[PDB]
Symmetry: C2
Subunit: 471 residues, 2 copies
């Protein structure tokens, strides 16, 4: 009786509705769109076909389309250089391609079209998170080896702003360069090359020779990452947007800070400090027309992912490794982020070791729950935490598979869709969870080392639960 009678998969896909899942492949070098209504992959693209010899396809965000099945657009970026050598693949390659591309891709109802390489046009090769603006007409990219982020206009493919963030440690000893505090300097960059182009293509600008991998923020202090400016790294990760407009939050993994910027005048306004027991925030002081500083007397723990709730009234930052928890600020005062204060922290006895790390997140459309991945190194099963986002309590934890990464949600709020990625070498897949029962409904096969996933949105209200407000 253990073998099911002949069973068709139609009922399974029919429940999800008409939603398209987009995924980058990391070491596979691909991007792909899947139709959750039929199980068909609608299209894919392999970067090496176009002459990118190191297409580590990393992060992406998609823009609202009135009918994704007829067409949509998205940005996907890459890493490059010695990032090829950090996931245990026994490649004999001597000189890896430079990478750090930023590609604009359009689905036309049949296939993907590679529209442009925005890194080649602008000179900004940035390899970490890609976030759409709340209006769907721009996007940001950050990089945690160069510590640069920029916001871009989609229609003109031009740079709206670019900033460099630097650390100056109180103690020059690598082991204590963050623990014992330091000064973070924020500089608004100006282009230096003809046509308003920046000089940051490829590996140019890297302070360290490869990324701090998932779970690996302390590998730099710990003396395992080479580079020419090791003790100046902050590891910028993402720029996430307040859905009510005006503010963005730039996450710096090593100092454990989220720097709030005013997008109206492009200035940093306050620094939120992640660690439990530390102040809600630290002031930002302007020291020159283009330069601001934040002073920290210690750094308690690094931090990971950040996000605003769909209504913009809560901001989350995940402390990791030295503390593993979800830190929550009351951001209800839209007029003045200097007033944003810590209101809750989600903790659990099972989070007391180095791992699991509280990781990527997605909120339900109504804000009532947030789903948060729980990351561990091999071989512990990674999983999903379900959190009550009104009372800030852990409801449930479920095991999924190795190397759990990002989460998306269908825009009717019914199904969370996530990816796990096998550390680029073992089991990978797409996991779907029902948000009413909080149960896994199934795993679909996936050739991918994905560190992202998005469901293509139809409207700007969808972006409030997409790769815009959170990572």
């Amino acid at each position: 009786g253990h073998m099911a009678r002949t069973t068709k998969i139609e009922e399974f896909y029919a429940q999800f509705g008409k939603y398209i899942l987009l995924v980058p492949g990391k070491f596979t070098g691909t991007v792909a769109a899947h139709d959750l209504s039929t199980g068909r992959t609608l299209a894919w693209l392999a970067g090496w076909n176009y002459g990118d010899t190191n297409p580590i396809m990393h992060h992406m965000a998609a823009f609202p389309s009135p009918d994704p099945y007829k067409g949509f657009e998205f940005i996907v970026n890459t890493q490059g250089g010695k990032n090829l050598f950090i996931y245990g693949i026994p490649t004999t390659v001597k000189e890896p391609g430079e990478g750090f591309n930023i590609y604009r891709v359009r689905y036309d109802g049949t296939k993907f079209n590679l529209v442009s390489n925005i890194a080649e046009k602008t000179g900004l090769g940035l390899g970490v998170h890609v976030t759409a603006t709340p209006d769907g007409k721009g996007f940001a990219v950050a990089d945690g080896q160069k510590d640069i982020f920029a916001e871009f206009d989609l229609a003109t493919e031009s740079v709206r702003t670019a900033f460099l963030v630097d650390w100056k440690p109180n103690n020059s000893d690598l082991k204590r360069a963050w623990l014992e505090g330091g000064t973070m300097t924020i500089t608004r960059l100006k282009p230096t090359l003809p046509g308003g182009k920046y000089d940051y293509t490829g590996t140019k600008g890297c302070k360290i020779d490869w990324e701090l991998v998932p779970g690996g923020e302390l590998f730099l202090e710990e003396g395992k990452v080479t580079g020419t400016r090791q003790t100046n790294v902050v590891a910028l990760d993402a720029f996430v947007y307040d859905p009510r407009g005006r503010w963005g939050a730039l996450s710096a993994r090593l100092p454990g800070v989220a720097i709030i910027f005013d997008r109206q005048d492009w200035e940093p306004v306050v620094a939120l400090v992640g660690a439990k027991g530390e102040p809600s925030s630290l002031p930002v002081k302007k020291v020159a027309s283009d330069t601001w500083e934040i002073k920290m007397d210690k750094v308690v723990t690094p931090a990971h992912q950040a996000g605003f709730s769909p209504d913009g009234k809560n901001f989350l930052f995940m402390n990791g490794v030295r503390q593993n928890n979800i830190m929550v600020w009351d951001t209800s005062n839209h007029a003045d982020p200097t007033k944003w204060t810590k209101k809750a922290v989600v903790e659990d006895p099972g989070w007391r070791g180095s791992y699991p790390n509280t990781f990527h997140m997605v909120f339900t459309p109504d804000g009532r729950k947030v789903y948060v991945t729980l990351w561990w190194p091999s071989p512990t099963p990674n999983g999903i935490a379900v959190v009550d986002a009104r009372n800030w309590k852990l409801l449930k934890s479920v095991d999924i598979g190795p190397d759990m990464q990002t989460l998306a949600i269908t825009y009717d709020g019914k199904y969370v869709v996530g990816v796990f990625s096998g550390y680029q070498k073992t089991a990978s897949g797409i996991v779907i969870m029902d948000t009413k029962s909080d149960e896994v409904v199934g795993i679909l096969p996936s050739v991918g080392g994905h560190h992202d996933c998005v469901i293509v949105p139809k409207t700007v209200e969808d972006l409030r639960c997409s790769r815009c407000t959170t990572t």
Copy 2:
């Protein structure tokens, strides 16, 4: 609804697929939906990893480990699928990789093309004992059979065409002489000199229906009128014999694997003789004389009991030709016994270029391929009475078919012409209905279910392609 009931109908089988233009290989667990492992060829410095064909060897427990061969194409094969790449100098490719799954990940064990000097980019087939494998190439018109344990060449042959009429449009229709030459290594350490694009007569593998494009002057290359377009070396499951398919002359040349000689040439076309003789003209050279070539042919393969051989005529006829090969002792006695035709099968399309039998031999499933935008599908053929039963539409660009070794489900892949919809399709062999499609990032031109026993190879990438 949960997917558990869906995966629970399958049993414990691993599907292995190459990605073609994705550059990947992957294994998926049909009992849970998980991808077990994958490998990306570009990560290893293969700059044009068009991952093409593959065969897996019997494993006592595939979930604890298994081994396979996957090859690549290279050169201007990058440029024939409509991708608007600006690459000017494509990687040489034509690698042959041995890959092992260890229960957790894939391990690239060796590049047998580098070790042997034979870079061969079309079908890979396992031998019936699971201890060797063949690779053929239809740009170079070379094939070889290899020993797995020693990673060494057992035999290699070159096949060449001398046309009766040197005009390109008439170079096959008006006949010619096919010369078969046993090759010997020419470099130190018993290595051949055929790596990368070395030896190509044409700049890409002929497409489905592509014999007409070669005749019309649309395929570039240095020896366009001397190509036969070898496709595969498929094995008689009873041992002793292999069949080398040559697409352009529409011939399957039968080899004796013990003394490495060609013994007879089966001629695909309806209305033509069952076979032509092979004449030995020198110690290492044999000839086949053809006064005309009535039509090309492509898919070729044996039924699981070895008693039937199939060759699919395409282009100028469109049918499945069937020989009685019940006489294992003497292939010169193999004789045409049936032809599967249909009013909907004419010309180049559908192009019937992959198949799989049920373990009991009662049915054969055959791909029905067409160019965009015609829906592609699967034909179900009665392999006892030799008649078409049913055709099912699947999606764009239907490619290979495998079967679970209990006979219950055909598992196939479709591939989007490297640019549109792709997926894994699963069909119930009792109802002959699709039970579902699973997503697949792949342009796969092959697929296999990892076998446990040598008997399983009778219905894997051994007896058919």
